């Protein structure tokens, strides 16, 4: 149902902020973060990719220099695939 | 390193010229929005108490324009050793011709480097204030449309009085 976010644009940015904030943690198990890993991809699609550039900002700051990471890489790959189907 | 930088005889004039250019630009911007004249500036009537010349203020009144016109110039002198004047120099405060000279291929890079140095200094100040988060290389358009005016004003103010500081498929 999340298609058509054209009226309010800072609150989607804040939710995009907090999911990448608590995507990682030392007090977090894999069975507890699997639902965030399945959550942020369904957030990253069914959305307009214009203001998700403000969080692929911090996608490139820490993850692709690093060889938590797999979910972000899969999200990036699927977002790039959907974009193919500043930012450049 | 801006506080541990050398200050030449041209910096004492360039800081005053940058303060005068900032005051003239601010007065010209306040003259278009129907500003009032008052002793203290308030948000009710939009009073202007700082609509005066640069040489007509005192030490307590130049405290908001002394160090901010000196730290950026010290950072530019520390990034590139260029302290010289080799060209001519160029209430109702009238701003001068700021759109006379276009930016050259080295001058645009110097303005970009001054914006990057100012953004890094602002980020270090914000990190020190948080300890006691935005890069300009991958900034958005909403920040690039707002941060470029300070770099353009600093370049247009440094270009006067002869103080011109001089320094995706193919790659794949």
Mutation target to probe the B interface, by most B beta carbons within 10 A, among A10, A57, A59 is: A57
Nearest chain B CA: its distance from A74 CA (Å): 22
With an 8 Å Cβ cutoff, are A60 and B140 in contact?
A: no
With an 8 Å Cβ cutoff, are A86 and B140 in contact?
A: yes
What is the 8-class DSSP label of residue B152? H
Is B103 within 8 Å of B156 (Cβ atoms)?
Answer: no
Is B68 within 8 Å of B81 (Cβ atoms)?
Answer: no
What dihedral do alpha carbons B92, B98, B99, B101 form, nearest 10°? 150
The residue of chain B with its CA nearest to that of A53 is B140
Is B74 within 8 Å of B5 (Cβ atoms)?
Answer: yes
> In the numeric block, which tokens belong to residue B9?
């005889």
B110: closest CA among B144, B76, B71? Answer: B76
Our measurement of the distance from residue B132's CA atom to the centroid of its chain's CA atoms, rounded to an integer in Å, reads: 27
Runs of H (alpha helix) within chain B? 11-30, 71-79, 107-131, 141-158
The residue of chain B with its CA nearest to that of A59 is B138
> In the numeric block, which tokens belong to residue B121?
């200094």
What does this entry list as its resolution, in Å?
A: 4.7
Our measurement of the distance from residue A38's CA atom to the centroid of its chain's CA atoms, rounded to an integer in Å, reads: 11
- C-alpha–C-alpha distance, residues B1 and B138, integer Å: 24
What are the percentages of helix, strand and coil residues in chain A, rounded to 5?
60, 0, 40
**Experimental technique for the deposited model:** cryo-EM
End-to-end CA distance of chain B: 36
What dihedral do alpha carbons B109, B111, B114, B116 form, nearest 10°? -70
The residue of chain A with its CA nearest to that of B168 is A88
- C-alpha–C-alpha distance, residues B118 and B125, integer Å: 10
Question: How many inter-chain contacts (A to B, CB under 8 Å) are there?
Answer: 8
């Amino acid at each position: 149902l999340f298609a058509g976010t054209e009226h309010r644009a800072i609150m989607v940015d804040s939710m995009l902020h907090t999911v990448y904030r608590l995507s990682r943690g030392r007090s977090l198990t894999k069975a507890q973060r699997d639902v965030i890993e399945d959550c942020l991809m369904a957030l990253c699609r069914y959305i307009r990719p214009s203001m998700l550039q403000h969080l692929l900002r911090r996608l490139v700051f820490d993850v692709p220099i690093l060889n938590x990471x797999x979910x972000x890489x899969x999200x990036x790959x699927x977002x790039x695939x959907x974009x193919x189907x500043x930012x450049x | 390193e801006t506080l541990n930088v050398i200050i030449p005889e041209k910096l004492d004039s360039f800081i005053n010229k940058f303060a005068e250019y900032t005051h003239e630009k601010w007065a010209f911007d306040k003259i278009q929005n129907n500003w009032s004249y008052g002793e203290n500036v308030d948000e009710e009537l939009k009073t202007h108490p700082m609509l005066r010349p640069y040489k007509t203020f005192s030490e307590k009144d130049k405290e908001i324009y002394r160090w901010p016109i000196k730290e950026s110039l010290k950072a530019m002198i520390a990034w590139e050793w260029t302290i010289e004047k080799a060209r001519e120099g160029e209430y109702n405060p009238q701003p001068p011709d700021l759109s006379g000279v276009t930016l050259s291929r080295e001058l645009q890079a110097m303005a970009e480097q001054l914006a990057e140095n100012y953004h890094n200094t602002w980020g270090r100040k914000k990190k020190q204030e948080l300890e006691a988060l935005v890069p300009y290389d991958t900034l958005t358009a909403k920040e690039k449309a707002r941060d470029r005016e300070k770099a353009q004003e600093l370049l247009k103010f440094l270009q006067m009085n002869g103080y011109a500081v001089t320094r995706x498929x193919x790659x794949x």
